[PDB]
Amino acid sequence: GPSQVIFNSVEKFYIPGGDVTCHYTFTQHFIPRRKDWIGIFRVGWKTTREYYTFMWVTLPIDKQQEVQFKAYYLPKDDEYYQFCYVDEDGVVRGASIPFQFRPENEED
Amino acid sequence: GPSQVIFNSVEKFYIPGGDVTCHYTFTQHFIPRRKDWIGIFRVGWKTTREYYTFMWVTLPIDKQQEVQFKAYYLPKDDEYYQFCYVDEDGVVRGASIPFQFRPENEED
């Protein structure tokens, strides 16, 4: 079904070694739950158990939301990744555009 | 460490269906932050993610502080609860005496 969690301001590349802020908003009828989470997943991931790293959904919740991924936990390779919001039932409720962890280049 | 947020005038029981005013004061060197909050937690809570309900810390801040919990959001059972002040880093900076939501009784 349609995404119930929308990622905003997602970059196409993030600087290696920097912390990354992930911005998201809940759609009108969506009810977030305390064990929901956001993963960073390699594009083409098969199951939610494959996340590279994750953060639990930011609490408390009443509006812009954000969660911070610390540099230590971010990918070091050149593969493509996305954010995915996974609810307590294991259902993906939102997914972002793909990005890499790399410096800016001329093709950008 | 020692509490940096002190709850005052906390009752041992609050009337079911009434709004509850939570009174607190900041200790001298404490610096409140805009995403700090006060939760109502069941006694014996393990993580700050377990709050029953919450309010963001009252703003603006310059002294007595207070925040109002609306009746709709309060517990309906007979369990024991407390207020806890949680800062932006997830650290508990103050905690109140325990209370229930119930009428006065003879044991009181």
Residue numbers in the entry:
A (entry chain A), B (entry chain A): 19 to 80, 87 to 132
Sentences from the paper on this structure:
In this study we discovered that the ubiquitin-binding autophagy receptor NDP52 binds preferentially to LC3C, in contrast to other autophagy adaptors including p62 and NBR1 that nonselectively interact with several human ATG8 orthologs. We determined the crystal structure of the NDP52 N terminus (aa 21–141) containing the SKICH domain and CLIR in isolation and in complex with LC3C.
The SKICH domain resembles an Ig-fold lacking the eighth β strand, which places the N and C termini onto opposite sides of the β sandwich. While this sequence is reminiscent of a LIR motif, our structure reveals it to be buried in a β sandwich-fold and inaccessible for canonical ATG8 interactions.
